[PDB]
């Protein structure tokens, strides 16, 4: 499904993302906007290394979820990558939380560095009531 901005902002807040490991709600919103455009069924195959990115946060199959076809992959979130394509984002959020527990934090997604870091991200949550 494709979330509307404020709809997603409120959902993420309810799921405990605001300030999780020092990451503000607006940063998560900026990441979701640039990764999938708030689309839960988004998938991107990376032909260079045989991995695929799944769902709202475009979580990679080499380290986080298992899709069975990615070489030398681990499944740190202990989830089928299929779980990251559901309309209910509960699992994708649990897994995103795992991703940032690593040293890099939110920096794990290059898209965050390119389009969110050091920028004014207030706009992603303004008027949503979060």
Swiss-Prot record:
Pfam families: Lys. It comes from the Eukaryota. One of its GO terms (molecular function) is identical protein binding. GO terms for biological process: antimicrobial humoral response; defense response to bacterium; defense response to Gram-negative bacterium; defense response to Gram-positive bacterium; inflammatory response; killing of cells of another organism. Residues 1-130 form the C-type lysozyme domain. Keywords: Amyloid, Amyloidosis, Antimicrobial, Bacteriolytic enzyme, Disease variant, Disulfide bond, Glycosidase, Hydrolase, Secreted, Signal. InterPro entries: Glyco_hydro_22, Glyco_hydro_22_CS, Glyco_hydro_22_lys, Lysozyme-like_dom_sf. It catalyses: Hydrolysis of (1->4)-beta-linkages between N-acetylmuramic acid and N-acetyl-D-glucosamine residues in a peptidoglycan and between N-acetyl-D-glucosamine residues in chitodextrins. It is an enzyme of class 3 (hydrolase). Its main location: secreted. Lysozyme C is capable of both hydrolysis and transglycosylation; it also shows a slight esterase activity. It acts rapidly on both peptide-substituted and unsubstituted peptidoglycan, and slowly on chitin oligosaccharides. It is linked to Amyloidosis, hereditary systemic 5: A form of hereditary systemic amyloidosis, a disorder characterized by amyloid deposition in multiple tissues resulting in a wide clinical spectrum. AMYLD5 primarily affects the viscera, and the predominant clinical features are renal dysfunction of varying severity, and intra-abdominal bleeding. Inheritance is autosomal dominant. PANTHER family: LYSOZYME C. Belongs to the glycosyl hydrolase 22 family. Lysozymes have primarily a bacteriolytic function; those in tissues and body fluids are associated with the monocyte-macrophage system and enhance the activity of immunoagents. This is Lysozyme C. It comes from Homo sapiens. The gene is LYZ.
